[PDB]
Every structure is written in C-alpha cells, then in structure tokens.
Amino acid sequence: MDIVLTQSPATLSVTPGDSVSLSCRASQSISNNLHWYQQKSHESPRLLIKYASQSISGIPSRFSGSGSGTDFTLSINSVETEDFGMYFCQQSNSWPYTFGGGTKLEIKRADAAPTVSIFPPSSEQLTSGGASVVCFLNNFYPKDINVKWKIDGSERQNGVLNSWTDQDSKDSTYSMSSTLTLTKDEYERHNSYTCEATHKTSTSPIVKSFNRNEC
Amino acid sequence: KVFGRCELAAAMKRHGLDNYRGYSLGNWVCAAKFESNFNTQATNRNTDGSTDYGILQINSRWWCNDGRTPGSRNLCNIPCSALLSSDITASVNCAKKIVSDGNGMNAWVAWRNRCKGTDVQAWIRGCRL
Amino acid sequence: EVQLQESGPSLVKPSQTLSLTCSVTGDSVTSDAWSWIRKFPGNKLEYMGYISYSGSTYYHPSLKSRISITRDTSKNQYYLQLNSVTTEDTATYYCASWGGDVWGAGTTVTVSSAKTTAPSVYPLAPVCGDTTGSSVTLGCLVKGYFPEPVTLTWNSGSLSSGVHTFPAVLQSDLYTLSSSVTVTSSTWPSQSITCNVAHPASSTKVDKKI
C-alpha cells in the first residue's frame, strides 16, 4: 500500500540547551529518500534535512539527520529557544509522497496545578432556550489532563466540547476550556453540575461544582 | 574520478537510487555506463550552447547552470560544476528530479536505446553490495 | 528571491469545487515543478500532488478523480481544482516547490453550507456573584457564529493581562469561542468589566458587561 511513516514520541518536552533525537520509521524501505520538516505555530513548514542526511545551506548546524532503509533520526544538538514546534518526516521514494504524523517539541518547565473555574448558563442564553456550562482550567503543566463532567453524580459525555491553547508564550504552561451544552429544558431537569479535573499535580481530582436548587 | 562498476552501484545504493520511483538499481548502473563509462568528469558539448555534465550526462540547457548556456532553465537549481565532483551527491539529486517528471528515465536517450526493457539487474549482478 | 502566495475562496459548499491559486514571483513557473500540500486539523499532512516543469502531473491516488492541477505560463501561476468537496476537505492549503525549499504562507479553505451568522455573546460570572480567593476569573462565551473570525477584547483593550482566549470549535455547523479573564478580587465587581466582540462578516459588534 502507500508508505506509512511512524514518528515517535508523539510529543517531547525539553529544556533549551539539551539535545534530542526524533524518530521516523517507514513501513517499507525508502533508502535515503526521507526528508525532515519543521513547522512552528502560525508558520508554514520549513525543510531542514533532505535525503536523510544532506544539509541545507542556510539551516543551523545543530540540525542533522541519519539512518537509511526504514529507520531515520533527526538530531538537534542543543535545542534552542526558537526550535519548539512540530517536526515531520516525509518520503519521496514512492508515489504518493507521504508524511509521518509528526513529533511535537515542547518546552520543559516545573509542574503546575490548573486553576479551575466553573460557570453556569447566563440568563440571556437560558431565555433563548440554551444552556452551556463552562469550565476553565488555566495555566497548568504538563499538558496531559483529564476533564470529566458529572450531572447529578453521573458522568456526562454528550454535549461536551473542549478547546486547548498552545503552550503559553508567557510562562510555558497550558490552558483549556471545557463546555457542556444542553437545552434549557435539560438543564432545568437536573441539579448538580460538576467539572472534575485529573492532573499529575495531585492524586485527588480538582472538583468545581454548583447546584441549581441554590443560586 | 572513474568509478568501478560495483563501486558505483554501491554508491548509487547508498544514495537511494535503487527502487526510486519504480527503477531498480540496475537501470542507473546501466545508464551511467553508457552515458559516461562511470566517469564523473565526463562532458560533451551539443549543437546549442549546452553541455552534458557528469556520470549521468545531465544537460546544461534545462537542468544545471554553467553561467554560459543560452536559454538555461536550471531546473535542478545547481551549478553544472557540482555535477563533475567525485562526490555523486549532486548528480543523483538532479537525476531524481529528472526522473520525477512524467516521462521518467526516458529522459536519457542512451537509457532507452541500451537499457530500457533489458535485464538491467545484470549490471549489479555479481556485485557484493 | 522566489516566493509563493496562495489565494482563492476561503469558503466552499459541500459538493462544489475548491479552487486555489499560487502566484510565483521572483522566478518563472516553468523554472521548477510545483505542489499542493494540505494540513488537516490534527497535524495530518497530505501531499495532494505536483505539476512538473514540463506540465505533466502526478496526483495522490486517494484524490485521483477529484483533483486537477494546472499552470499558466503567462501569469506565472499554477492552480488546484478539487471537486465534490465535503466537510473533510476543510484544511490549510499550501503550495510549494517540488524541492520543498519554498512555501507559500498557506490559506485555509473551509467546506460548509452554513450562512453568515452573527454570534450570541454570553457573560460568564460565578454562581451568585460569589467571590472566593484573592482573585476572580470571569468569562465570555461567543456562540453560534459563521464564518470565523471574531475579535474579542476586555474593556475595549484596557484589560489585557490574565486573559485566555481559546481557539474556536465547530458546534452544530457554527463556531463557538470562549475567553477568560482573571483579576484581583479588589478589581471586580468594584470596577466594571466588559466583553467586546466584533464579527466583521456580519457587520456586528456587541459589548457584554459581566
């Protein structure tokens, strides 16, 4: 079939100054026809290494590649502050050209517990017949976090939409907002609404909740 | 430099030409042989002001720039001199770009005439690569 | 010196045709082979196909049927045509040289049958205006607008610290975005805090005091 490129790890968190090695494996041998691209947020992809290990005039020397056949590696000798973002490999050995799923280079920093806030539906939205319950989980680290909604003690999954910010440029933390949307009728049929956050900064989840019966 | 047949095939393999876009290694060994006898410094002028350079006799009117060829397109974005190196890196890269066109290796007339449709695997047959 | 730039309808309806243009400047379009590459929502890249320096073409098999790539030697531009689109063709499209040494800034093409729709702006405030810690966070939910984008500010810009405005998500064919702002408890409700939302496509701007 088409050649599949598998990149690992999915994400990598390092401190500027450290060195890293990114992996890309092809489902079939492609000799040296593997290329490495970098793509920073809000920017188009940039070619860093061509044909597995050839350097591109104009690309910083800290970037180098190795391997052949089905195993390739992109190395960054002392990652620099401007090196964070996505890294993709791509093969040109057989048509169609295909890309790996990419590896994300993120900045390492001290763990931080999220600041959780929950909000009930506004009076205006309820008047229009809708009911969104919003929960903000701000400035946490690392990025992995689980958010579970519960209505009257029952986990709720339908109606939930989440949005995640990119690693914060100000302090390298992450933030996300989880919104549970119901109709006004559904909302008024229940009492306790809970936003529960499970993060590495604590064994016990952070719980933010409110009841309709009061307030 | 003048490559040995097997020496060149090993190099061409290292440079990823074997099975590149459906062309076994033999095809490239055979083409080099008939185009330049494995000579990286080979050149040949043509009626127009163009010249064929390197182990694969790549034309200077469409593929490389020698700063003195009328109607140069420099499709390979490379100085023709890079195609005369003992290091075949550049000649291979450009060959890959040429063969990536619709008509593939049919770009090398010498390939069609003496390699196309033959048991090209014979050219790497015997090599310990 | 060679530079690329994509342009074309940012909005295509299901079953219709997606058309994009790539203008080549600094050099001739006949001076290289060129490609179209698209990026789907989860960092999924797809090499759609390329057109050679000769005009011949190579199309990704998954698309071979809906795709067409052409060039115009007089205007030094090449094009992408993609028929019978569906919501799945929503992505950021980029044009690049075959060599991958030059790339356009890329342009987003969204496939949807939604009609322009002003958003509903909802205030996010704690249950029964209950302030707790030393600080308090308020919010603004911008719901059901189309197409993107909207511009959100707090107190007409005078409140810029402690703000988190999240990427919009598609909800029932329309977009929904939220924004949080955190201030000291001595700040709110003592001082008024207002959410300002502008949606150019619908000629709308609304202020919502929290």
Statement to judge: residues A132 and A153 lie in one domain:
yes
Phi, psi dihedrals of residue B22, rounded to the nearest 5°: 75, 25
Question: Six-digit token pair at A12?
Answer: 């990598």
Just list the catalytic residues of B. Answer: 35, 52
Q: How many CB pairs under 8 A join A and B?
A: 33
CB C113 within 8 A of CB C12: no
- CATH at residue C129: 2.60.40.10
Q: Which of A109, A130, A146 is the last residue of a domain?
A: A109
d(CA A133, CA A118): 7
Closest CA to C95 of C199, C5, C25, C180: C5
| Pair A101, A124 in one domain | no
Q: Residues A178, A149: contact at Cβ < 8 Å? A: yes
Report the amino acid identity of residue B110.
A
C106 shares its domain with C119? no
The answer on C124 and C109 residing in a single domain is no
Substitution target from B93, B99, B100, B103 for chain C, most C beta carbons within 10 A: B100
Coil/strand/helix, residue A75: strand
**Hunting for tokens 């074997």 — which residue is that?**
B18
d(CA B69, CA B85): 20
Q: How far is it, in rounded angstroms, from Cα B11 to Cα A192?
A: 71
Contact B100 C52 (CB under 8 A): yes
Of A109, A135, A161, the last residue of a domain is: A109
In chain A, residues with a C-beta closer than 8 Å to the C-beta of C106 are 44
Residues C1 and C99 in one domain: yes
Please state whether C31 falls in left (phi above 0), alpha (psi between -120 and 50) or beta.
Answer: alpha
Residue C179 has phi, psi (to 5 degrees) of: -145, 135
Closest CA to A83 of A110, A108, A66: A108
- Does C12 lie in the same domain as C88? yes
Phi, psi of C44, rounded to the nearest 5 degrees:
-105, 110
- Residues A44, A13 share a domain: yes
* A127, A159: one domain: yes
Q: Is A184 helix (H, G, I), strand (E, B) or coil?
A: helix
Q: Is residue A22 a contact partner of residue A103, using CB atoms and an 8 Å limit? A: yes
- Count of domains observed in chain C: 2
Q: Is the domain of C87 the same as that of C43?
A: yes
Q: Are residues C84 and C119 in the same domain?
A: no
CA distances from C207 to C46, C128, C201 (A): 41, 22, 17
Indicate whether A132 and A104 sit together in one domain: no
Binding site, annotated residues of B for substrate: 101
Interchain pair A51, B22: CB under 8 A: no
SS3 C14: coil
Q: How many domains are there within chain A?
A: 2
* 3-state SS, one letter per residue, for B78-92: CEHHHHHCCCCHHHH
DSSP string, B50-100: -EEETTTTEETTTT-B-S--TT---TT-SBGGGGGSSS-HHHHHHHHHHHT
For residues A119 and C124, the answer to whether their CB atoms sit within 8 Å is: yes
Cα separation of C149 and C204, whole Å? 12
Kindly state whether residues A122 and A164 are assigned to the same domain.
Answer: yes
Asked if C24 and C122 sit in the same domain, the reply is no
Backbone phi, psi, residue B6, to 5°: -60, -40
Quick check: A32 contacting B, CB < 8 Å? yes
* Exposed e or buried b per residue across C85-114, where buried means at least 16 C-beta atoms within 10 angstroms of its C-beta: beeebbbbbbbbbbbbebbbebbebbbbeb
List chains adjacent to chain B, taking adjacency as at least 3 C-beta pairs closer than 8 Å.
A, C
* Residue linked to tokens 């009728």: A185
Tell me the C-alpha distance between B45 and B128, whole Å: 36
Cis peptide before C149 (omega within 30 of 0): yes
A101 and A116 in a single domain? The answer is no
Nearest CA-CA distance, residue A45 and chain B, Å: 20
Cα distance from B29 to chain A (closest Cα, Å)? 17
What distance in Å separates the CA atoms of residue B14 and residue B28, rounded to the nearest whole number?
13
d(CA B71, CA B80): 14
Cβ atoms C161, C184 nearer than 8 A = no
Instruction: Give the residue from chain C lying closest to A132, CA to CA.
Output: C141
Statement to judge: residues C81 and C130 lie in one domain: no
Question: Which residue carries 């048991």 as its tokens?
Answer: B119
CB proximity C168 to A under 8 Å: yes
Q: What's the token pair of residue B31?
A: 């083409």
Please state, in angstroms and rounded to a whole number, the distance separating the CA atoms of residues C152 and C24: 35
Q: Which domain holds residue C166?
A: 114-210
Contacts of C72 (CB under 8 A, 6+ apart): C29, C78, C79
Any bridge partners for residue B46, and if so which? none
Yes or no: say if B91 and B56 are a contact pair by the CB < 8 Å rule.
yes
As given in the structure block, the two tokens for residue B33 are: 């042989």
Alpha-carbon span C80 to A58, nearest angstrom: 30
Note if the bond before A96 is cis, omega within 30 degrees. yes
DSSP letters spanning C157-187: GTB-TTEEEPPPEEETTEEEEEEEEEEETTT
Backbone φ and ψ for C126, nearest 5 degrees, come out as -60, 150
Query: Around C99, how many Cα atoms within 13 Å sit in the side-chain half-sphere?
Result: 16
CATH number at residue A72: 2.60.40.10
Nearest to A31 among B16, B22, B93 (CB): B16
- CA gap A164, C147 in Å, rounded: 20
Residue spans of beta strands (DSSP E) within chain A = 5-8, 11-14, 20-26, 34-39, 46-50, 54-55, 63-68, 71-76, 85-91, 98-99, 103-107, 115-119, 130-140, 145-151, 154-156, 160-164, 174-183, 192-199, 206-211
- Shared-domain flag, residues A98 and A116: no
Helix (H) or strand (E) holding C139: strand C135-145
A30, A51, A93 member nearest B93 (Cβ): A51
- Do C184 and C109 share a domain, yes or no? no
* Domain termination site, one of C113, C130, C147: C113
Cα–Cα distance, B56 to C119 (Å, whole number): 63
User: What span, in angstroms and rounded, lies between the C-alpha atoms of B12 and B88?
Assistant: 8
Residues C138 and C34 in one domain: no
In a shared domain, residues A159 and A119: yes
Tell me whether strands C107-111 and C11-12 are parallel, antiparallel or unpaired: parallel
Examine the domain organization and report whether A100 and A122 are in the same domain. Answer: no
Are C118 and C51 in a shared domain?
A: no
Is B97 in contact with B76 (CB distance < 8 Å)?
yes
Chain C interface, best mutation among A99, A177, A209, by max C CB count within 10 A? A177
How far the first Cα of chain B sits from its last, in Å, is 20
The resolution in Å comes to: 2.1
Residues of B in contact with A53 (CB under 8 A): none
Hey, is B121 helix, strand or coil? helix
Joined together, the tokens standing for residue C113 give 């049958």
User: Is B16 within 8 Å of A95 when comparing Cβ atoms?
Assistant: no
Distances (CA, A) of A211 to A117, A198, C107: 15, 21, 45
Nearest by Cα to A28 from A2, A49, A8: A2
Nearest-by-Cβ selection for B73 from C31, C52, C99? C31
Specify the pairing of strand A63-68 against strand A103-107: unpaired
Residues 6+ apart with CB under 8 A from A127: none
| CA–CA separation, B88 and C39 (whole Å) | 35
The Cα C176–Cα C168 span in angstroms is 5
Query: Which of 3.30.1490.20, 3.40.50.300, 3.40.50.620, 1.10.530.10 is the CATH number of B1-129?
Result: 1.10.530.10
C159 beta partners: C154
- Give dist(CA B95, CA B112) in Å, integer: 15
CA dist list (Å): B115 to A145, B30, B33, B47, B111: 60, 6, 10, 25, 5
Do A94 and A114 sit in the same domain of this protein?
no
Q: How far is C32 from chain B (nearest CA, A)?
A: 6
Distance of CA B33 to the CA centre of its chain: 10
Distant-in-sequence, close-in-space partners of C54: CB < 8 Å, separation ≥ 6: B101, B102, B103
One-letter identity of residue B32: A
DSSP state of C114: P
Q: For residues C168 and C162, what is the distance between their CA atoms, to the nearest angstrom?
A: 19
Answer yes or no: do B89 and A54 touch at CB < 8 A. Answer: yes
Two tokens, residue A199: 């993060």
C-alpha pair distances (Å), C99 with each of A56, B77, B114, C173: 11, 10, 30, 38
Measured between CA atoms, how close is A99 to chain B, in angstroms? 16
- A124 and A97 in one domain? no
Q: Are residues C18 and C108 in the same domain?
A: yes
Per-residue burial over C153-170, b if 16 or more Cβ lie within 10 Å, else e, is: bbbeeebeebebbbebeb
Q: Is C195 helix (H, G, I), strand (E, B) or coil?
A: strand
DSSP secondary structure code for residue C112 in this structure = -
CA B41, B42, B46 angle in degrees (round to 5)? 135
Question: Which of A35, A118, A164 has its CB closest to that of C100?
Answer: A35
The amino acid present at A177, given as its one-letter code, is S
* H or E stretch at C23: strand C18-25
Burial of C11 (C-beta count, 10 Å sphere; 0-12/13-18/19+): middle
Question: Which of B85, B108, B68, B66 is closest to B15 using CA atoms?
Answer: B85
Enclosing H/E stretch for B111: helix B109-114
What is the three-state SS of C121-134?
Answer: EEEECCHHHCCCCC
In C28-111, which ranges are E strands? 34-40, 44-51, 57-59, 67-72, 77-82, 91-97, 107-111
Q: Determine whether the interchain pair B101/C99 forms a contact, defined as Cβ–Cβ distance below 8 Å.
A: no
Asked if residue C178 lies in contact with residue C124, where contact means CB atoms within 8 angstroms, the answer is yes
Is the peptide bond between A16 and the residue preceding it cis, with omega within 30 degrees of 0? no
B77–C99 CB contact, under 8 Å:
yes
B10 CB-contact burial (10 Å; exposed 0-12 / middle 13-18 / buried 19+): middle
Who among A86, A97, A124 is closest to C47 (CB)?
Answer: A97
Contact check, Cβ <8 Å, B14/A68:
yes
Domain coverage including residue A121? 110-212
Q: Residues near A152 by Cβ (< 8 Å), separated by ≥ 6?
A: A190, A191, A192
